[PDB]
């Protein structure tokens, strides 16, 4: 079915590096240079107050829509990723359900400015105070902290491409039917990532990457805060949350 479902040679690992970086370049959603350039476009105290005065449900709906848009690009990345479309549909869905949010969380560090602790949201850079109406400050600050720790790594676009491919191709996801096939694909992607770090003298980042448990906790907290919102505004979720968002985080 796929070359990366068996033992890959060095030349084939080199080809995988190029492929993953290209699939990422084609589905990265926002270009890094556009995100970097807009860092000086910061929300005013008046604009921040405007977001803070928005209702909880309207802020939740806007964030769910923006998160859904980012997830759509991750689905495309997955689709272009070597071996992914050769896995069975159950496995494809398992991997995306568990991993899409995690890939989005990793990708978000590109949109985060560690210098002033702001993130790119709806055209400008705003701090965590921008999301006060949500009423989940512990989850917001934990996402900000995560983006802060990844930003400290000075990730290149190629590093993000290879690392997110690994976040997604995780043979430990509960419910995988063709586990060994995923295990082999993950191993080749690990080799691709580590080869690139070896080749660019960036192996020092290996011990600095977040523990796998960290992305899992962030995703679990999101699912939990969504259930609390769902109890308060059930018709909002049912009527105005994107269907893709509900399929992934509220069982349909």
């Amino acid at each position: 079915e796929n070359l990366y479902f068996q033992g890959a040679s060095l030349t084939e690992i080199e080809h995988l590096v190029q492929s993953v970086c290209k699939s990422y370049r084609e589905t990265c959603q926002l270009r890094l240079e556009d995100l970097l350039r807009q860092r000086s476009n910061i929300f005013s105290r008046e604009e921040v107050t405007g977001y803070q005065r928005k209702s909880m449900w309207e802020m939740w709906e806007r964030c769910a829509h923006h998160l859904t848009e980012a997830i759509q690009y991750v689905v495309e990345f997955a689709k272009r990723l070597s071996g992914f479309m050769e896995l069975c549909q159950n496995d494809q869905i398992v991997l995306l359900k568990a991993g899409a949010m995690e890939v989005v969380l990793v990708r978000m560090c590109r949109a985060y400015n560690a210098d002033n602790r702001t993130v790119f949201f709806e055209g400008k850079y705003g701090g965590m105070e921008l999301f006060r109406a949500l009423g989940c400050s512990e989850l917001i600050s934990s996402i900000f902290d995560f983006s802060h720790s990844l930003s400290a790594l000075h990730f290149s676009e190629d590093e993000i491409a290879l690392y997110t491919a690994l976040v997604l191709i995780n043979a430990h996801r509960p419910g995988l039917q063709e586990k060994r096939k995923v295990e082999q694909l993950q191993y080749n992607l690990e080799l691709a990532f580590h080869h690139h770090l070896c080749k660019t003298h960036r192996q020092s980042i290996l011990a600095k990457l977040p523990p796998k448990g960290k992305l899992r906790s962030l995703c679990s907290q999101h699912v939990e805060r969504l259930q609390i919102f769902q109890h308060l505004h059930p018709i909002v979720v049912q009527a105005a949350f994107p269907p893709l968002y509900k399929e992934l985080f509220s069982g349909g």
Binding site: V75, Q89, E247
Partner: peptide, 12 residues
Amino acid sequence: KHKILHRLLQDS
């Protein structure tokens, strides 16, 4: 009972 993922995966 939404099923957007299979649609997205199937669309080419």
